[PDB]
Amino acid sequence: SNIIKQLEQEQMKQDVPSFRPGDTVEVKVWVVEGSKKRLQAFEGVVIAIRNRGLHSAFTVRKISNGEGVERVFQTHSPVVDSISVKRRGAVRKAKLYYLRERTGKAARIKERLN
Amino acid sequence: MIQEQTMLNVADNSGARRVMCIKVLGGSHRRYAGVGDIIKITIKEAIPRGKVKKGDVLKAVVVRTKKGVRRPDGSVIRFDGNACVLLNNNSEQPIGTRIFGPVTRELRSEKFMKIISLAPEV
Amino acid sequence: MIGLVGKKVGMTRIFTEDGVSIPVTVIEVEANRVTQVKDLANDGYRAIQVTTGAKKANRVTKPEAGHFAKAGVEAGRGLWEFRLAEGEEFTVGQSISVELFADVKKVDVTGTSKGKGFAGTVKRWNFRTQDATHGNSLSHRVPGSIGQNQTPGKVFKGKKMAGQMGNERVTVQSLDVVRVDAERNLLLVKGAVPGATGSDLIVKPAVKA
Amino acid sequence: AVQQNKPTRSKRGMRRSHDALTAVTSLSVDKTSGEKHLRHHITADGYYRGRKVIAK
Amino acid sequence: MRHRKSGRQLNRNSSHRQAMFRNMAGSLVRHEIIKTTLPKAKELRRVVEPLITLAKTDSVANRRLAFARTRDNEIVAKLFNELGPRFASRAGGYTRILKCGFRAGDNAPMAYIELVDRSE
RNA sequence: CGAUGUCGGCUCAUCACAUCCUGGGGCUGAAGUAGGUCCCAAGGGUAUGGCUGUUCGCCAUUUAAAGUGGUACGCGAGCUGGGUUUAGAACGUCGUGAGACAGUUCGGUCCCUAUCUGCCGUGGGCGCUGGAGAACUGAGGGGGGCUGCUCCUAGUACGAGAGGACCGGAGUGGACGCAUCACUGGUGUUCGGGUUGUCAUGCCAAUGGCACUGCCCGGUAGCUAAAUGCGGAAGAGAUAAGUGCUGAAAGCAUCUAAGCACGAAACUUGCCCCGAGAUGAGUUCUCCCUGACCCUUUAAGGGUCCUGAAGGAACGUUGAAGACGACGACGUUGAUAGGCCGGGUGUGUAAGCGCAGCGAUGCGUUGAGCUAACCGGUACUAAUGAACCGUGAGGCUUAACCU
RNA sequence: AAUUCCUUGUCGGGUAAGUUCCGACCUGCACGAAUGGCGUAAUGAUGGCCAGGCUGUCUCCACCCGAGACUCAGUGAAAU
RNA sequence: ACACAGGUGGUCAGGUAGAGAAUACCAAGGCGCUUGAGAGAACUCGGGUGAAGGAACUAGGCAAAAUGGUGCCGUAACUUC
RNA sequence: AGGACCGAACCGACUAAUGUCGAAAAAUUAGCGGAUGACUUGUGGCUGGGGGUGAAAGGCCAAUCAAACCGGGAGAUAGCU
């Protein structure tokens, strides 16, 4: 809709680096602890990307000190601050859910390297 | 998304391995327990010489759910297993000492400063 | 006090500074204009009749046209009305805008719910399903007993059964207004109002507070 | 699941009240051939709004 | 409750459904005019018309699609050669629907469907 | 006894008050907290499992509370068939035996397309007094009414101390209900792709058919929840139990007989929905029609010719509207539906061709190719001009005002 | 106990909780030796019970694909 | 009793894959089952899928889901060996 | 070798669902048991009603069984409706 869309691009952020599923990403979060407005990091591979304009959002899986944690992220959310790609993976499927039932050597993805 | 009969995992060296949720606490006819909830659990699998033993019935708080949680932004944090922290069946005060895995920011309610003081993540 | 007559335009969300993703309904509210004003002199109650939008010459009837002509305001599809509260006043033709809400805190939305059509009890009244196993026969989702026996020997009026869900002039209350943009006639509320995008909605100030 | 008393003539008359089958009560004459046909229907011969479409 | 949905079930399981349209496809092209029940006709448009759009641009790739769909070597020949150029100008609306009456035995509302050109 | 299907469970409930919880009070062997007991009060709420055919009961764990009964020990033309309550068989026991036992044990067909009442929805006809179109008032009816916990007042009042408030204010919960897809997901046999077997398109290549969509992977629109908003109320009137003021009868005393004031989730409102078939059929605004003539038991009469208005209906395109009707939008003066163009979305580097490799295959061309329902536009196609229904100024009496 | 009315006997195990189950106890209402007693590998569309797996059985149901149900046309019953 | 989803002995019996007369796809050959057209409500029958949990269901894991093939490895109590 | 194992034809009929004025007066769909034997089947024979036959249920004996069907005693008798 003319209404909605004009209204949409109002909040849609611009400086979003392009990336594809399977690309290892570093994400910075505006986490706040009462007063301490910190900028915590979070690095896991991207396993799915949703492109719905202002509602676009991706998700990353990180195997940290224990077991897997799948955290989605509203792309244009102010809570996320920075997005740096670290390694561009070479997969050939939009959604990588199948990573869930595998771990370690059984998991490691390829490298795209162009 | 924990409820009765759910079979969780212990998030600390408390003395057990695997447990079972026999009762959600708080409110009549409560259906589900999530990250910040206290549940009555029995013990289904103890560690040979732990501080507890198979067949005990004590309160516990879950810390991770496969169902995940939701923040004021719309994001969610789905873990890969259902994990809980044991408590004394009389006065909460976590039993174990060291806690494995991360937990969540939505657990600080002042009566768990012991917990978040131990969490190695989030 | 008197509200306006917007239109459901879709649903969106507003990212606050902290990231609180307030889901909002975008209700376009054109400049409603007064056509007829009623008074205690004739009708015993004081109220104003408004309109919005526009019709087509080939679809605007003779009776309708004359009524508008009496007010000199172009035919806007529909003719709603609002009871006054005696603390105000109005004159014919006034192109009232969304300016009213730019000062309220909470408002109330009225509209026609989605037409689910003929719907069974499980969906209409959340009746609990019968066991779909253990020998159950042909009665997996039927209502189940609806009376007692010879003593009352009849079905009590008001009994919940299957029928038509929807098209009800439902009303939500206490909805928080998020932001108001007069620029393109935008009333942004927090919540989820009744109707299908493109269906008219009556908004007015929250009563309870 | 059966009637108790046998319904009378009066009743089935009332039941059959709405079974009236109204006729077309509307006939369209072609602007060119001057034939009777249903609105938005090619003529029996095969013309339509002046045109000779069916060719048969 | 099919709100906002689209398509037509036509009392036919899908495999059976896509079957006839493919068969009904060539027939509409092989003869350039056919008789059929109206509801079907309205639906047939949503298939054959887009097919013509395909043929407009001749290409080894397209030809294969025209064979992938409609599984007809002949219609492909009838396409890309005659129907392609003839409709070069028109933007859509490659078909016409005419109400013709009711089928004898079962009062099915027949209707004619024919290509817009239909003129030698 | 020419048939009233009988326990329990599931489902759906509805009423009573002899009230489990929540509300308001009196007394106390009531300090406070927590209770005992009695009075008023039926609005709302009023468990999850283990064991048993179980009602019951016991136990484990909760909860503000896990009420007591009536309703053919509610409810089989709604389900179940465990129990009981046939025919088989065995144990104990009784009997010489055939057999027998609220003694036991294993197994053992539960039919019915709804005429009427009722009830949930939704239409047609006519009435509403000339007709038509919209908008309402509003009698009356219905829905909803639950409550925890934490914090503040305040570790204050009380109290040896331990413990630990009333009143009042704020936040956050559980259960129930309503609305909605923005977010998270489900589905998504009309979208993309991988792949087994086999058949066919002359063969390669490339595709299609069938095998539960062949098996699978993801997936738009819708729909939907576990997802996301909001709701219960505050206030007012009249009271119950109860507390009172003044105050005689009865020089006193006394809440009462005069008079006056307080006082609960109950009652009437307040909030939401239906609703003028409310025949007591209401009100407002606007629109349309103001021609001749015979007959007669000359009567709110019958009849003929010429006109048929507003509007409606029918037909077609149709819809987040829909079982059918109905309801909303559109009908060339057009964006109503399909298609087309562009974009989005999804799937994941098509085909063809060149190169390396013995080959399977990889690489470049290429984030290409293909895209359902989605968004913005575009009359290319289809929504034909007319005809059909509907009239030609609207009774009598009386009164108040204009002639 | 396929047998025990009392009886859900008492004790132990299994379960957060076990009138069923498994092991003992003898107080055998009213077991008992070819109307056989007591064991028993294997077998069994056999009775009871527990555990792993798996799952819409269930919390609590949602969506979708088809065949009826619904409408139009032809034919056209029945119990009562 | 019917142009009725039932019952009726023997004989012949190709290709591909497959242990196979199973089964999947075909050949020869023979059929689309003698009411159809629309719509795409509740509800019923057959089906498919399903977040988290996983027998809490229930008289009872009834029903479904699930396991499923060839070859090598390995395999207890008990036993009439 | 086997009243041996697995599993089609064949034979049988444990469970669930549908059906119940049914497609059918006992079947269907999906799974279940046996499957070289006390097996199963075609054709023709023999046994007849207080009799037959029975791996025994009072089971079967032409949709009929604690005494078949058809005709006759016979208009049995009916303190009952």
PDB file of C-alpha atoms (C1' of nucleotides) in Angstrom, chain I residues 17-51:
ATOM      1  C1'   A I  17     -13.166 -48.564  11.396  1.00  0.00           C
ATOM      2  C1'   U I  18     -17.108 -48.190   8.055  1.00  0.00           C
ATOM      3  C1'   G I  19     -22.015 -50.371   7.276  1.00  0.00           C
ATOM      4  C1'   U I  20     -26.617 -51.313  10.312  1.00  0.00           C
ATOM      5  C1'   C I  21     -34.312 -49.035   5.954  1.00  0.00           C
ATOM      6  C1'   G I  22     -26.079 -51.735   4.143  1.00  0.00           C
ATOM      7  C1'   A I  23     -22.781 -52.441  -1.992  1.00  0.00           C
ATOM      8  C1'   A I  24     -23.939 -57.306   1.284  1.00  0.00           C
ATOM      9  C1'   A I  25     -30.015 -61.215   5.475  1.00  0.00           C
ATOM     10  C1'   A I  26     -22.167 -61.600   8.288  1.00  0.00           C
ATOM     11  C1'   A I  27     -19.266 -57.980   3.768  1.00  0.00           C
ATOM     12  C1'   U I  28     -15.327 -54.010   2.917  1.00  0.00           C
ATOM     13  C1'   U I  29     -10.642 -51.290   3.891  1.00  0.00           C
ATOM     14  C1'   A I  30      -6.119 -51.710   6.843  1.00  0.00           C
ATOM     15  C1'   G I  31      -3.357 -54.734   9.335  1.00  0.00           C
ATOM     16  C1'   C I  32      -3.503 -60.195  11.559  1.00  0.00           C
ATOM     17  C1'   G I  33      -2.809 -66.949  11.893  1.00  0.00           C
ATOM     18  C1'   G I  34      -1.388 -71.431   9.066  1.00  0.00           C
ATOM     19  C1'   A I  35       1.031 -72.067   4.762  1.00  0.00           C
ATOM     20  C1'   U I  36       4.934 -80.302   2.969  1.00  0.00           C
ATOM     21  C1'   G I  37       0.389 -81.045   6.446  1.00  0.00           C
ATOM     22  C1'   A I  38      -3.968 -83.577  11.966  1.00  0.00           C
ATOM     23  C1'   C I  39      -2.938 -79.365   4.962  1.00  0.00           C
ATOM     24  C1'   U I  40      -6.312 -77.619   1.157  1.00  0.00           C
ATOM     25  C1'   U I  41      -9.599 -78.409  -3.178  1.00  0.00           C
ATOM     26  C1'   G I  42     -12.580 -80.489  -7.756  1.00  0.00           C
ATOM     27  C1'   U I  43     -15.925 -84.751  -8.998  1.00  0.00           C
ATOM     28  C1'   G I  44     -18.885 -88.829  -7.478  1.00  0.00           C
ATOM     29  C1'   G I  45     -20.674 -91.555  -3.415  1.00  0.00           C
ATOM     30  C1'   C I  46     -22.696 -93.278   2.141  1.00  0.00           C
ATOM     31  C1'   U I  47     -25.061 -91.866   7.007  1.00  0.00           C
ATOM     32  C1'   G I  48     -32.119 -89.028   8.021  1.00  0.00           C
ATOM     33  C1'   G I  49     -34.708 -87.025  12.505  1.00  0.00           C
ATOM     34  C1'   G I  50     -35.266 -89.298  19.063  1.00  0.00           C
ATOM     35  C1'   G I  51     -32.018 -90.385  13.922  1.00  0.00           C
TER      36        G I  51
END
